[PDB]
Amino acid sequence: PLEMKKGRGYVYQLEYHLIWCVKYRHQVLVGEVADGLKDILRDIAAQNGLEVITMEVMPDHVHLLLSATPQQAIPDFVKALKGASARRMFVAYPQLKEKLWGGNLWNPSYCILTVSENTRAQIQKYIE
Amino acid sequence: EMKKGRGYVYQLEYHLIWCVKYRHQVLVGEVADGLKDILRDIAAQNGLEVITMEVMPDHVHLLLSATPQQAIPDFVKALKGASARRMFVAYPQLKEKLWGGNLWNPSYCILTVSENTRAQIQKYIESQH
DNA sequence: CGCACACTCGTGACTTCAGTCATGAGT
DNA sequence: TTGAT
DNA sequence: CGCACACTCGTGACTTCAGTCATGAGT
DNA sequence: TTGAT
Ligand SMILES: [Mg+2]
Ligand SMILES: [Mg+2]
Ligand SMILES: [Mg+2]
Ligand SMILES: [Mg+2]
């Protein structure tokens, strides 16, 4: 049986692998800065109705595995996740301005991949 | 494999399914054939790639590939709302069983698709080296 | 190298009112 | 301030 | 009879200007 | 006008 969420006019299962990097690929996401970023990203995610299945912060990039509804558009939540986290991180960690004084904490691009929650076998069963 | 746009790199696939209103097995013969041409056309207009398409008498199944900017409610609306309008015009006999102004069930089912499961993907994430 | 996602300049949209998203072009 | 997830 | 995704009515947005999307409530 | 992909 397929894992499926139900909403008003749709049944769905939507997961994405989202990834982005620190501007200039600076390795600044370490220690308390990485810990903070985890809080900030979870708060933004919940504020936006996103479920964070997995989160991993490496020094120069972030990897998220998200579960969403059909109404949450990609450019919208990526903007929330990155734009708001940049704003907060700079406030909470003024020391970031030492390596990133240009007004950006993040690389201006994101990489995103859809993800199958269920197996190909489960899908053919449901689809047949 | 991975596509690119001005500010993003992505690979987006979705299984999209919806049924005929009241579950009537109406999509058959020339009606089904015309549905396919109408869907392919709508997909073309909206720049949506249709990887797989299947039309059963009571429901449709598509495997789509899209850009990050193509939101789900928008493309589902385009494919279902436009095809319905067009199907009734092209095949009026549909009205014999569906005179209420709806060719489609008001719901859609949609699943993100990838070349691996999240279980595997998350483990790959928890590693680092 | 010469791009390009990633660097830079530019545009508008819109939250975080800063710094992303959208976006074209030059290197 | 870049050099790849 | 009650549900709901699937039936219906209700509320709007927006193309297909009809019939879907958004959506809350009854059955 | 419904009963499940
Ligand atoms: Mg960007
Ligand atoms: Mg609907
Ligand atoms: Mg270019
Ligand atoms: Mg209900």
**Pairing relationship of beta strands B13-19 and B108-113 according to DSSP bridges:** antiparallel
**Inter-chain CB proximity B114 and A115 less than 8 Å:** yes
Q: Give this entry's resolution in angstroms.
A: 2.3
B3 and A CB contact within 8 Å: no
Please report, as a single letter, which amino acid is at residue A82.
Answer: K
d(CA A54, CA B121): 10
d(CA A48, CA A64): 15
| Facing residue for B8 by CB, picked from A16, A56, A110 | A110
Q: What is the DSSP letter of B95?
A: G
Evaluate whether A53 touches A65 at the Cβ level (below 8 Å). Answer: yes
| Facing residue for B121 by CB, picked from A2, A115, A127 | A115
DSSP calls for A39-95: HHHHHHHHHTT-EEEEEEEETTEEEEEEEE-TT--HHHHHHIIIIIHHHHHHHH-GG
**Ordered alpha helix ranges (H), chain B:** 30-46, 72-77, 83-90, 118-126
Distances (CA, A) of B85 to A106, B82, B103: 45, 5, 8
Closest to B112 measured CA to CA, from B1, B14, B21: B14
Q: What's the maximum distance between 2 C-alpha atoms anywhere in chain A?
A: 58
**What phi and psi values does residue B24 have, to the nearest 5 degrees?**
-65, 135
Angle between helices B30-46 and B83-90 (to 10 degrees): 140
* Structural biology method used: X-ray
d(CA A13, CA A117): 7
B124 catalytic per annotation: yes
Evaluate whether A81 touches A23 at the Cβ level (below 8 Å). Answer: no
- Residue A24 CA to nucleotide C1 C1', Å? 19
Tokens of B55: 């039309």
Nearest-by-CA chain B residue for A8 = B107
d(CA B60, CA A121): 19
| Facing residue for A111 by CB, picked from B9, B113, B128 | B9
Between vectors from CA A7 to CA A3 and to CA A10, what angle results, nearest 5°? 80
Distances (CA, A) of B70 to A52, A74, B14, B35: 22, 9, 12, 22
**What phi and psi values does residue A57 have, to the nearest 5 degrees?**
-110, 120
Tokens of B54: 């299947």
Evaluate whether A65 touches A16 at the Cβ level (below 8 Å). Answer: yes
Residues of chain B with Cβ-Cβ distance to A106 below 8 Å are: none
**Pairing relationship of beta strands B59-65 and B13-19 according to DSSP bridges:** antiparallel
Q: Which nucleotide is nearest to B73 (CA to C1')?
A: E21
Number of domains in chain B: 1
3-state helix vs strand vs coil in chain B, percent to 5: 40, 30, 30
Nearest-by-CA chain A residue for B105 = A9
Disruptive mutation site among B56, B107, B125, B128 for chain A (greatest number of A CBs within 10 Å):
B125
d(CA B90, CA B97): 15
A58 and B CB contact within 8 Å: yes
Give the residue whose CA sits closest to E7 at C1'. Answer: B22
Evaluate whether B26 touches B98 at the Cβ level (below 8 Å). Answer: yes
Element (H, E) at A79: helix A74-79
3-class secondary structure, B32: helix
Sign of the dihedral defined by the CA atoms of residues A71, A80, A17, A114, in that order: positive
Domain extent at residue B91: 1-129
Query: CATH code at B34?
Result: 3.30.70.1290
Element (H, E) at A55: strand A51-58
Q: Which residue has the tokens 């429901």?
A: B59
Q: Which residues share a beta bridge with B9?
A: A111, B4
Which of A78-110 are b and which e, b meaning 16 or more Cβ less than 10 Å from the residue's Cβ? bebbbebbbebbbeeeeebeeebeeeebbbeeb
Evaluate whether A55 touches A63 at the Cβ level (below 8 Å). Answer: yes
